[PDB]
Amino acid sequence: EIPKPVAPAPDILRCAYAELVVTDLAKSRNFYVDVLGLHVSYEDENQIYLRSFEEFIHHNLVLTKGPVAALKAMAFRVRTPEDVDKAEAYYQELGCRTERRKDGFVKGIGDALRVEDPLGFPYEFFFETTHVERLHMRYDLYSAGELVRLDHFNQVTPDVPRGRKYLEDLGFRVTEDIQDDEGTTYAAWMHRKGTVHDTALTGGNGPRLHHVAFSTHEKHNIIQICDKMGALRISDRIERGPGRHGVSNAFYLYILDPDNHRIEIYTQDYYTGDPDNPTITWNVHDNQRRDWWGNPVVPSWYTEASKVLDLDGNVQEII
Amino acid sequence: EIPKPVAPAPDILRCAYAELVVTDLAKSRNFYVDVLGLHVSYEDENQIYLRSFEEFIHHNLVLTKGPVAALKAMAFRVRTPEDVDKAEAYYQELGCRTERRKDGFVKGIGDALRVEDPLGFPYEFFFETTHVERLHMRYDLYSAGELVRLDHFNQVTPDVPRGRKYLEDLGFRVTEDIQDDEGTTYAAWMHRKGTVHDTALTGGNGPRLHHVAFSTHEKHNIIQICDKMGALRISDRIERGPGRHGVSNAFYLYILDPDNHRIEIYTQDYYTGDPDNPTITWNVHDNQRRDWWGNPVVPSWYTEASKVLDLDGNVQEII
Amino acid sequence: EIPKPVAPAPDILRCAYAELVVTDLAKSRNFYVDVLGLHVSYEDENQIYLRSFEEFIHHNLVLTKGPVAALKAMAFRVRTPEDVDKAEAYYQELGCRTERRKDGFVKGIGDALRVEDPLGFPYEFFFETTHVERLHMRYDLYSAGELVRLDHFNQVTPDVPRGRKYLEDLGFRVTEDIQDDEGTTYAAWMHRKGTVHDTALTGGNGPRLHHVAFSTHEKHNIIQICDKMGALRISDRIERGPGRHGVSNAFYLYILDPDNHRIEIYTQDYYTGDPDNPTITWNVHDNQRRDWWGNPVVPSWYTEASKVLDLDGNVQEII
Amino acid sequence: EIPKPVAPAPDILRCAYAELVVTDLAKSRNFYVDVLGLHVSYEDENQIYLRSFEEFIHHNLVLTKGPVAALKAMAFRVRTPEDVDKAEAYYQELGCRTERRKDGFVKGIGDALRVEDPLGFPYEFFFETTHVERLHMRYDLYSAGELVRLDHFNQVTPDVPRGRKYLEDLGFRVTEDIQDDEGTTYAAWMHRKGTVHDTALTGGNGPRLHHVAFSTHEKHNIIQICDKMGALRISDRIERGPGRHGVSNAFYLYILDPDNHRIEIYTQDYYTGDPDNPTITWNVHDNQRRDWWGNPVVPSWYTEASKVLDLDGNVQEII
Ligand SMILES: O=C(O)Cc1ccc(O)c(O)c1
Ligand SMILES: O=C(O)Cc1ccc(O)c(O)c1
Ligand SMILES: O=C(O)Cc1ccc(O)c(O)c1
Ligand SMILES: O=C(O)Cc1ccc(O)c(O)c1
Ligand SMILES: [Fe+3]
Ligand SMILES: [Fe+3]
Ligand SMILES: [Fe+3]
Numbered sequence A, B, C, D: 001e002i003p004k005p006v007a008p009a010p011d012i013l014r015c016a017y018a019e020l021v022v023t024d025l026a027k028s029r030n031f032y033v034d035v036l037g038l039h040v041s042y043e044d045e046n047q048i049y050l051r052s053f054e055e056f057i058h059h060n061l062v063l064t065k066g067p068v069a070a071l072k073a074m075a076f077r078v079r080t081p082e083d084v085d086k087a088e089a090y091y092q093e094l095g096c097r098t099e100r101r102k103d104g105f106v107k108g109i110g111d112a113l114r115v116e117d118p119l120g121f122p123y124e125f126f127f128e129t130t131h132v133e134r135l136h137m138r139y140d141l142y143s144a145g146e147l148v149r150l151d152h153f154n155q156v157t158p159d160v161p162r163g164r165k166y167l168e169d170l171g172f173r174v175t176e177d178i179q180d181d182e183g184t185t186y187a188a189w190m191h192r193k194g195t196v197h198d199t200a201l202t203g204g205n206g207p208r209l210h211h212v213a214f215s216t217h218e219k220h221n222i223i224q225i226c227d228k229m230g231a232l233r234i235s236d237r238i239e240r241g242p243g244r245h246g247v248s249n250a251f252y253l254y255i256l257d258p259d260n261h262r263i264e265i266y267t268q269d270y271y272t273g274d275p276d277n278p279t280i281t282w283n284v285h286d287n288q289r290r291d292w293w294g295n296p297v298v299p300s301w302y303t304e305a306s307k308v309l310d311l312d313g314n315v316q317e318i319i
């Protein structure tokens, strides 16, 4: 069991960006820029910084050339600069390794803290970031499958209850969960920003990053991504969907990048900001909890997930 | 090989309606009316006459109570009254069994000819029909998953090449087909009205009705049908889809009625009205020919199909 | 200038419901339930309590039969039961008349505070409310023009800069505003929940309620409301739109109910939850600020708005 | 009154393309290609040949550089090469100037006949045309406001009844019209291809071209065109709409190109292919006949329209 610190939890606003290590920067760029249409905030020969259509912070996704494909950091923006200090004290009290860089770990981000959390994931907490042009009204750049915001991460861990209690201490609230008859949690969705989730815990060998998710405005935008991928003859990279999720009620699509990092395109969440928001508990045997339409969920979806790195860049041991 | 008659072929306009036999009229009404939203032109304790949102003839679907679930007739409307005379002459020269009725076989239809065509299917040709209120601007009745037109039929036959030649002599033009390296047709789509098809031949044990298809205005209308079915907990009746077809380029969904008759909901076809319309031939090994996004094709979709009746009301023998 | 109280402001979550007085309950029920499709949580011969599709609190709109059509209260839910006491102390320090009912002023709301705020508006603050069945996955009830959430109110007041400061002291953050060359604010949008706004101030004779807005999932849903009204032959009740707003970037529509209360249907907002969300200031002479497509602005839109009631039930005098 | 020829009328398939004369080829290219996204089949310094997404014939629109903007030709494709001959005999019997070119008047078109029809319009009839790659499944190219088909032309002429008769003898069928109490036609919509119209007559000083129309798959694509124009700051070129037409029931938008030629973007028509398709007659006083939502019809819409050229290249005198 992970103890609850005496130190006050940092006030987390929302998931902000993920930093993924990719093996071939040009193939990855072709997938994220030419196929998916994300907007390049900055790039050089080692890294590409991308942002979604409505974002005003520097980026939502950093692709870093690296020898082994993996999740290098999942970042959450905190409410004030002092929350970075709170995060540092908080994770130190939990006995976790932390690394603080006043100048940031990646471009566009200022004072930041990366930690190897209790579940083995590399989390970053930061407030400062360079504001860039919000492209929300740049309809001259709007693509038929435009990704408008980064919505959430989904982590794979062996002990979901244990991770659940840890994130609830951190301030995340469960919006929906999957439980057995005994009341044991099998998976949980938790938020800070007011949508169904900023992150989620799914049971399995971990630590591993299951996917990063972006949303679109409407359902036809998701359908265009599938049509485009079939026209580019890469439909084999469509893993699951499109479909309607039971948990979260979102219309979804799961596709795979060149390094097999899973990306989810999502839309039509509901508001969960009130403090007594009614948690929705689905039974582990309910066939409509994952796919509302009852579609069989691909085997690989449960088995394949991305490796994550510790703070020295080594791959975390999978349990 | 079916021979080409000397008598001129009747001018076929488009598929017009199908008469299906169902076993429990109340269960069927609940499906076609309460779930799918088709509009009742007329009904009594033995039959229900249904039309789509934009239709102006009496109906596109007749549900007839009967002992065994089956297709009792697939009807095509012809251009002029005299065309019913032509179809009669034509099918007699092919030595087919034909039954004529100046007063029709079902309400709403006038002088009609039914026949057991060469492939064993019960085709009806008619011109006269009672006009009813075209509901195309009845937005107060417009449902979120509204079916707006009857689009086509799809027949299962053991010898597609044979079937194809016959339908081509009848005036249908092939828009798309699937062939092997030897130039052998495994499936063909053919039209009269200017969309990709009015009917189609898929290979297998026949004669059997593979499905009847209706269209919607937009893609989200099809997604709504799935969502609605998941909410009524009958998602086990969603057979295949939704998806984008390779052949026809349509967005589609296949669902099963209470008697397992298969209904397809389809949208966004292209214009095939020009005489030199480019035929599109797909290779039997192209994984994108059926489902453009590469989705696995459900087994039942290839093996299950509805039985058809002869003019005496008996189930045609399957070959 | 309204002074900033020493008392802490209440923690406001979001706009929650409005209570409108209507003159003919049957006519209003026809407009809100039959035309618009809102869901009845409760109703008797004197009031109708309605909620949107994804709502879980008791209602988003209360129709109260009364002599003069007017806004009786615009309500905001606060984070904790204690925030109601903070709101009471806060408004008293401001010198406003306040009325506290531990049992609510309408059904489904518990301990609440109503006040005649500094601008003449009847605001209510409450935390307790009866939870009802969240219909977010009831696709069997989903209509083609489904209103899914209550989003914001828009208030008419003579002095925007004066009201803007008071609302900012209350904790609302300005997301977009319209200003002239001298930097004077002509209209402002402000929020608590993370969308562009929970309320907004537009300059004009007041206090008056300009409109209440609900949102839909997608753009076609707003188009359907227009189509259905044309089919019901009440297209004259369509006042402005549909269009794309410049400020807020939302797709919108304004319609008038039987008593001329204006309802806005809106969709496609962006996230404003970060504390340094960049404010977008539009110039008073930019022609795309109101309607991005440059459509002409209907004159009634600027002059007509609803009267508001003081706590005794009399129409507030308009300045 | 125009007499009915003895010679048989040519079998017209559908409107196929328009040749417009533009004063600045670069500006026109910018509008038609960069803003609207039409596809270039061929271009040089004097002309640009464009086609819609689903077209297979060489082009749907030809932009021809010239001193005075005007419509040089509105072309209809015929069913067989012989129909071109019938066309020539037919118009010659009507006493109209004709000009035949076995090699076509523009690239990609074969044996064609241009004439100065009875109303002063430069019509063209042709069968042969170079086929080009049909882009209907090129989703890699699909834009958010993709124009998919050329649908119709709309002509301005002083005597509508006079022209209606001549077009009906030509084989066009009236699907909808506007009449007064005396039964006098003020406007008519007529087709060949099975949609609401291939051409239409609106009373006014003529001959003049009112607009050429392209369609989109869904309503949101039309909305994107407006949004994009807003972003490019050319919203002043949006003339009327978006809206829902009463006549035709189509969702529409009218925009102006660099030389004021009017383009209509439109979607969701209904099938008019049956010979006894009910004609819908709208009363001249029905306020929903043009705009179903009852929106004011811009004055310019009624007064401005493009000049037409005679076979010599001179502007036809306007009556
Ligand atoms: O479909 C499922 O497997 C469950 C589910 C719901 C919402 C999500 O975001 C997700 O990633 C997975
Ligand atoms: O997906 C497939 O299996 C092929 C296909 C294409 C279009 C149709 O209408 C149909 O019924 C089947
Ligand atoms: O179009 C306008 O006039 C400005 C505007 C923007 C957003 C809103 O919600 C609103 O009610 C008015
Ligand atoms: O809205 C109108 O003014 C009449 C109308 C109907 C259908 C059309 O295509 C058109 O161009 C004009
Ligand atoms: Fe997810
Ligand atoms: Fe089909
Ligand atoms: Fe508003």
Ligand SMILES: [Fe+3]
Binding pocket: D152, D153, D154, D211, D213, D264
């Ligand atoms: Fe038009």
